[PDB]
């Protein structure tokens, strides 16, 4: 029924699409081993046009310029395309967005909105038009919802499927007024959707497709229950009968089988070793006392000042507060984003920080996933983390679709704990390996 | 040894000095009733060569682009200069700043750092050159505090004296690194001062000079213990000993008699009558209710829109956030100033507002008093003071140094205790008087 596209209009392919920039190595990608793991697991195509993507599908991908797919793509569009549950793990910055946005769509073109949905087009209460979307997509942070419902509208571009996006900080009402305009695939935030749910404005008793994007993140100790409360508690259909999709960069053993309870006869896709980084990326790690950090970060700032964007994460929100502080008073341009800044300041530094206009953007972990930002080219731990997975994400945000890029880490006596696990990592990846660090692990 | 200038470097002399503007109705201040009272008042000049300014002090005043004095100007210089404590009240924008920055300046330079100070060239323990200020300021925000250290910077130029200032928000480590470069003047807010005292950074125990900026201000129930805890409950030189000066553009009377447990044997000056405007201040006063402001505000907005700077004063800070946002969503170049807000966001803004580039301030009463700020031409009561001494001190931002301005400002029935004042002051103003301001006014 929806496979037949609608009038397109300038304006909003100009405000759309922005060109993008593939990378000098988006060709090394075809060198990586793939993995699949499962019963009956589709063969994994070559192009976009070795399966049925609708005319939309195909115009909205040869607006972006999206030449050939990317190994997550090629293995797991068809995947999404033979209804199966998925779980899938590919390196940062390697297209999963576009992995399960693409079938997704072009099922919901082919299929329709269903005898379910076509049955509520003949009444609906004035305001109590609660919705009832076909997909959901779940994101671990506001600014990463908003990216991913932003690269739906990109691809939902001439079709009867309209995309929304809900998550905390923003005002309510603008939201409820946009979904009362209609919804079918729903990004959202844990809390802000549950509070849509109790206030009987979204329903997903007919929510048939479910992504958990950065999934080992949503199923941590803190996200676990509101996912639960989403997906087990209310009125979603149950597995087997919903299709649920999973995608990380990073997939611990224990919450690969967590993501068990909520997947059924899935297939599991490894573009590479689960957890591993980009070749493109050089990684330092330099030793730093805290006392000599801020100094140290100075010279990194005033080398790296070239047209490129730089990208500083630190521990706690009280700390990127304290260092915006300091590198605005010694004349730099920079904002923060944390979680102690208001949600228009908080997307406002996002967007300063993507346009220019302030290169240097201080960040606790909001920012650590999911986020893609064209040319930022330096990735600085003022603090380290406490685990390898959260190191690999930060460091993800650079070296994206093929470019390159560098990411500097300070170590010390309170990053003891991360020694072994970041050396193994700059093994496999090909990167010097600063000698102390093997003296530090014993 | 200190009367004597210093080399110079136009490097500086362009990132100090701006132009100095002067406005139409300068001469007007001569035709202004100046009282003093008290024992023995020092005459006042005329000229800036009536009395001995250092080199420094008269180079530094061509450079300003400094005619000829203010009244203030004139009666406060050789009090100050004679070491006799001082009130002195003036009009907004009227020079108070410098009425009392130089005299004191001069008298540093001439006097030099005393015996006292010069009895500390000869050892120091490591780390713990806690300075030991000749001069103090106090003021009563941040970005007022700014302000004056700046006005300060200009007027010791060529000199010995290095001034700083401190002041919450910012980093603490930058401000220490500041002070042990040198302080010779201090301008400072409440607490950051406490706090670096505490820490054992700065010492009041030479300090001979006390200015009290924005007095009546320092001296109300929430600062009186603050100024209190600073000079009396600490190692400042009591009364007789040190030299007080306290300057406003409004002086209640109880505040004024409060004012004399700080103050041995002073001068009263009063270069008109005390919480008096300017003349070159248009005050205009409509009603409006509620629901309208917003709808009244955008009207006006639209209309003085030339290449003028608009203040836009209201009374919460959450409704200062919520206008800025109303505007900002409305397509206006906004930002906001108040508590809320990160003291990097705070001076952000006014820098922003001062250049240009967002020529709409919102703005709680952070902005009230003291700032000057060139090419400000309306100014807007979105929301009336409780009382007409705020008032005063909000129109004052715009019309200042015998420039023009607008003040408009928004009435109902919620300001309705502000009548009485507010029609007393427009007609000593000689200004248009509403009709319902009279009948409303008893
Ligand atoms: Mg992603
Ligand atoms: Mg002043």
């Given at each position: ?206 929510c048939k497709y479910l992504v958990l994007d950065e999934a080992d993140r949503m199923l941590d100790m803190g996200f676990e229950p509101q996912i639960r409360r989403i997906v087990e508690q ?24 967590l993501a068990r309870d909520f997947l059924d006869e899935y297939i599991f896709l490894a573009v590479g070793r689960v957890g591993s980084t980009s070749e493109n990326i050089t990684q330092k790690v330099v030793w730093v006392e805290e006392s000599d950090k801020r100094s140290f970060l100075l ?144």
């Amino acid at each position: 029924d929806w496979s037949k596209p609608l009038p397109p209009s300038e304006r909003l392919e100009q405000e759309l699409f922005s060109g993008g920039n593939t990378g000098i190595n988006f060709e090394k990608y075809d060198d990586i081993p793939v993995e699949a793991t499962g019963n009956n697991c589709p063969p994994h195509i070559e192009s976009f046009s070795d399966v049925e993507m609708g005319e939309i599908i195909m115009g909205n991908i040869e607006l972006t310029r999206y030449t050939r797919p990317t190994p997550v793509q090629k293995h797991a569009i068809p995947i999404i395309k033979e209804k199966r549950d998925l779980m899938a793990c590919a390196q940062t910055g390697s297209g999963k967005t576009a992995a399960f946005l693409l079938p997704i769509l072009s099922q919901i073109y082919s299929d329709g909105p269903g005898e379910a949905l076509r049955a509520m087009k003949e009444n609906g209460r004035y305001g109590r038009r609660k919705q009832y979307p076909i997909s959901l997509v779940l994101a671990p942070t506001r600014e990463l919802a908003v990216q991913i419902y932003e690269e739906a509208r990109k691809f939902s571009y001439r079709s009867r499927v309209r995309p929304c996006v809900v998550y905390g900080g923003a005002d309510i009402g603008q939201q409820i007024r946009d979904l009362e305009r209609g919804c079918h695939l729903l990004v959202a935030t844990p809390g802000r959707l549950v509070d849509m749910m109790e206030r009987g404005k979204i329903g997903l008793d007919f929510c048939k497709y479910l992504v958990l994007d950065e999934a080992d993140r949503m199923l941590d100790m803190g996200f676990e229950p509101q996912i639960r409360r989403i997906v087990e508690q209310d009125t979603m259909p149950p597995k087997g009968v919903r299709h649920t999709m999973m995608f990380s960069a990073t997939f611990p053993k224990e919450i690969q089988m967590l993501a068990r309870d909520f997947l059924d006869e899935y297939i599991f896709l490894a573009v590479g070793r689960v957890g591993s980084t980009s070749e493109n990326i050089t990684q330092k790690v330099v030793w730093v006392e805290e006392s000599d950090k801020r100094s140290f970060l100075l010279d990194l700032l005033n080398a790296t000042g070239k047209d490129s964007l730089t990208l500083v994460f630190v521990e706690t929100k009280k700390g990127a507060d304290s260092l915006e502080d300091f590198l605005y008073h010694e004349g730099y341009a920079c904002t923060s984003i944390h979680g102690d800044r208001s949600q228009r300041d908080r997307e406002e530094a996002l967007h300063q920080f993507r346009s220019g206009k302030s290169p240097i953007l201080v960040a606790t972990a909001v920012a650590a996933r999911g986020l893609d930002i064209s040319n930022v080219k330096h990735v600085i731990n003022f603090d380290l983390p406490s685990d390898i997975e959260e190191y690999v994400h930060r460091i993800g945000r650079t070296g994206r679709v093929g470019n390159l890029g560098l990411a500097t880490s300070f170590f010390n006596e309170r990053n003891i704990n991360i020694t072994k696990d970041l050396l193994d990592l700059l093994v496999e990846a090909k990167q010097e390996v600063p000698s102390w660090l093997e003296n530090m692990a014993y």
